[PDB]
Amino acid sequence: ELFNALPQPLQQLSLALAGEIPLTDHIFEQAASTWHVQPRSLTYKLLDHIPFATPVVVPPSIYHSLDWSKCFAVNQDRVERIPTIDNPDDVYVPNSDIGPLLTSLHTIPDYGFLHPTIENDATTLRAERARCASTFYKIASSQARQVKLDPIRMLGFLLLVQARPRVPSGLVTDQPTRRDPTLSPALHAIWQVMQYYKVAGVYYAPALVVPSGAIWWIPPPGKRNVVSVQYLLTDLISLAILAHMTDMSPTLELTGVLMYLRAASSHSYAYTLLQMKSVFPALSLRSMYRNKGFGGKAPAIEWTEPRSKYKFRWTGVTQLHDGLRPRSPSMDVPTLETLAKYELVDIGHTIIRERNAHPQHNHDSVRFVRDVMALTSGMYLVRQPTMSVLREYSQVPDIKDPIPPSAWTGPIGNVRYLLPSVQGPARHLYDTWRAAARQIAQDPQWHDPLNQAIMRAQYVTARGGSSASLKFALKVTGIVLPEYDDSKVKKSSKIYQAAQIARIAFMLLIAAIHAEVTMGIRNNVIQQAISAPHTLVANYINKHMVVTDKVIPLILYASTPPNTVVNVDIKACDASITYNYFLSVICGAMHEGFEVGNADAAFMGVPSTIVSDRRSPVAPYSRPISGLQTMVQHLADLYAAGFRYSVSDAFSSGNKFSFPTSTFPSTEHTANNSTMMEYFLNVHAPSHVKSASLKRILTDMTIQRNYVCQGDDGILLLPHEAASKISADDMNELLTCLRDYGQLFGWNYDIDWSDTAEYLKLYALMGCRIPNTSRHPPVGKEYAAPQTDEIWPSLIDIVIGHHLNGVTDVLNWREWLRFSWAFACYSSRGGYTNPRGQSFSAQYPWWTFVYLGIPPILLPGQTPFIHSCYMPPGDQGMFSILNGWRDWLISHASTTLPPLRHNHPVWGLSDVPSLLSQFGVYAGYHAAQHYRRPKPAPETASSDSINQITSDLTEYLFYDSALKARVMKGRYNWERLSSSLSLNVGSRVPSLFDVPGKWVAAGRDAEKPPPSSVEDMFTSLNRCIRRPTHSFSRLLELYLRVHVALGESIPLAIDPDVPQVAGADPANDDHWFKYTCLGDIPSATRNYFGESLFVGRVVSGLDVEAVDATLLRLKILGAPPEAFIAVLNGIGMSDSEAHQIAGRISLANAQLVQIARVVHLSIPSSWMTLNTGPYIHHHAYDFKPGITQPSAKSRDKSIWMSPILKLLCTSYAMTVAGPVRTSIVTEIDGSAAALSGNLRVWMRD
Amino acid sequence: TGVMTAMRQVKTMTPFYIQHMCPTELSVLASVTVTPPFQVPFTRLVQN
């Protein structure tokens, strides 16, 4: 059997994780070091223990391999472009073996790496062959790197979860699992593949994974190590996991496997999958319910006031019928024919046979749609960077109606105006952009110095950026010499550094007109600042424009079978904006709108030059243009020469380039979406659609209503003459007049109408959101780099991003929670070996994952699986566990450990901090608060870290216009106030002196932190484990006074048999409860949620919720009005603008969540997709005057006190794993005015 | 108002062309076609 085949430590853990033994730190530690010590290939032996009955037979043609030498030609001078076999797009990877080009690594024999000799040739002398070999090894060991860890390890956790059956929890609606590991086609095809890699009884994995990349095993003579098998195992593992967290039927699962075995067998594994990526949502999600007899329940959502403030409201239940079926035809004819060419038709007829057995909209039907959509291979697809640029970036759009050259005026310097005669879609684009440019040019908003410092903060990216080259190898065109390091400089050309390099003349200088030399360097801060009036106008078109309340509510309303919905996705909206049509009308219109401004007004540091103006043939005359028009003359000299790309990929060896194209990797190809559809519904489609009925429908349709634009995506929802839509006459003739409308100016519209709704990759069928589990797979994670970046505790943040991202999805939790726990444990045994010294290690105890968000399986006093996966992370969850069993550990430590002599007011004389320290709670509490990334070493050239000149002069870019005085008035008037009078913080309130330090902390975050720093991380980590402070935190020790007891479940928010979310059916215990007790559509009252944050305009270096808390955190205390203006001057706001905020910030009319933010009680990301708005302020009492005690009566202080107490209640109410229920503060240990005073001691810090 | 008062005042020769030039163009074009013009008399604003 599988269970008695495992190692002693693992058998105990599998038992422990399953629920039989609450796991202790000894169970956790021995199971952690059992993984890292034993060889990784040994967990493939466990496949040989389970018997198998699935009829999946792998072909012997998997291991055949067309060699890489035919499929990796250096067509250009140093470009390893793969010569496609049969296509332009067959370039993902070749299904070759790396048999010859491997030399055995001496540490792990029979596991080789790139040949030492071959690598040298590529670096020194190109070997059309000696570099084509190197670009094949660094792709196949990078395509086998798109994975969270070793996938052989991720399979090893699934055998732990399937080692034992789960202990029955005791809940009524707890279904034991139906999945049998002896009946699974995924991990039977793994073992059938793994027979080929067998040298005398032992298994060799074909590619052990190292943070530099994969290490491929060297086959003995006669066998081939084909690179596709490692990806064929990475998908088959990811199917073996997604069919044990989904309860996928064995027959349905079998079809998915045959999809993979055909793909490994053909020439390219990666390529085959891509051509059949949409072959599985089309069979099921797109085509559900077309048979007669359709009819279940579906929600009845309303659009309240449609024009703006999309505020959908869940109002009722519809009863479906044979009418309002999906009018669109099924995808069986089209996808199956496409499917037919790869010889899997039989896997198409199986899924069609299953789908015809779900005729009506049930829980079982919409669970089936998630089962088929979890069959698409969610692995990422690495392609050579040089090769990728050729096939993606450079595709010039085809225009079926160009602007004639006699439709422009004469030139005015560089740009041209459009003539008034030429109507069409070009005229509406010109008129909607010129009218918006003549609103921006007459505006007081962008002349304020704080708005300038915000705009300079958007250019140096606080998040993102790319590998820009430099500036002074591009300023040899100019005369301006750039700044150099005063002291040793660490940051290399960081977007921030570019600002640092030239900050002498407001981050730009009309002496710096050499911004057009080498742009967009990616595999510029002065081109982002030349493009100021291009995204200033695009942020006026995008006035009407989050996912949780502006998309999730929508997708649902659009999917209901009243209104039929066309979803419009534009393919390559980047590569459709060209200067031949789109970007010349834009720069033409902005230069026309920018004349209603004062024609001598400089903008953003660019003066007001003159221009030729030759647009009249009888009188050309020099004309002074404005400052904003001067940027347009340099935008038109930049957009017309395209964008340079200095792509130099590290995958291919010598591949360096200089690439010009017309694609930008900001919000304009978002902004052009609405105005080009506004012309469709009003002018173009009523002009010709050849249908009397069709024309009638369009006339009553606008674009503010009936269209929701975002990015390149968008949903077009028709007027209410809806379900009654003739698909032959109306909805297909509306589509061909749409798809030919976009082709007359290059926009390749890709319409795919069906009665689901796709909106930025969140599908929903019939009022029920369907999560795509292959969008973020369990084993898969992109990296997009040769060498990765994994020190050691950067695996823990992956695990919490692996667990919580699977629970936004309605993945079954019990199979999932156990899997997450097993995976979490592996991520607790780490190490670091010095290059010239001793090796090191660390051991995170469990309870360091309970503090991070993973709920525990079995505490020592309970029954397993009663802590829900919606438990909030941190102190809200550490309270909501300790509030659960405080009646247990007090009774247990009264009959074990001796009583303490003094009294802890939360407990009694029963001594539980010496019991909590025995269970390892404090060692888990102080471990996760300890930092995880290695600190950049504190090394400078001079002044003991002071007088740094790259940090002190990034402030010069942020201090233009005597704003510098306001942040100096802020840090003076606050330090005069706080450190001597009262409210003495000791640390800085979030002022503007932190963010030039924050650009360096996000800039000096260099790779390879030296061995001096990561050893210092390992030593500091080991001290906070061995001597974790016995005392808890200062917030948690005050939260534990509250005794929260919860009553019977609250009146429901959804008739709990309409299925709202992809399988949160009674197979799932709590996910069906928390999605029907609470509702979806998370729009609530304006006294709870309504997105205030009473500052709004942050400087982008500051957290918005750090200002919003500390503006409230003073108002809780006895703050003088001076302490509000001194903090708000620290952000840089003017004294007049700070005063209007200093009077506003009252607890009366303050969002309930904001008050909770003061003491760091946040609504977490786990239930952001839930309607916890009315739950907190209706139910979850802070005082129910008959159950509660009069001792816990927050009297006068209740305005700010109640929010905290209502969020401690709902933290306990979502942590337990049943229906949500009314949670009452029973009593507080010590009175509530003796706790409200206790928080105000902490709120002075 | 400002749109239609442009369409009222835009000069156009086809009001002139229909009263003056097209009758001497129609009467020539009715003697060079193999089908002679078949006309019933136009009646304007007369019910009976």
Binding site: S421 | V3, L26
Partner: peptide, 27 residues
């Protein structure tokens, strides 16, 4: 000669015609 460039210049400051030659030939 029919050409809307007289009309479109005047009407866009405030923002083969076979159906004309058929209703003349129908007279």
């Amino acid at each position: 000669v029919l050409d809307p460039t007289v009309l479109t210049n005047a009407i866009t400051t405030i923002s083969d015609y076979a159906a004309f030659w058929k209703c003349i030939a129908s007279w």
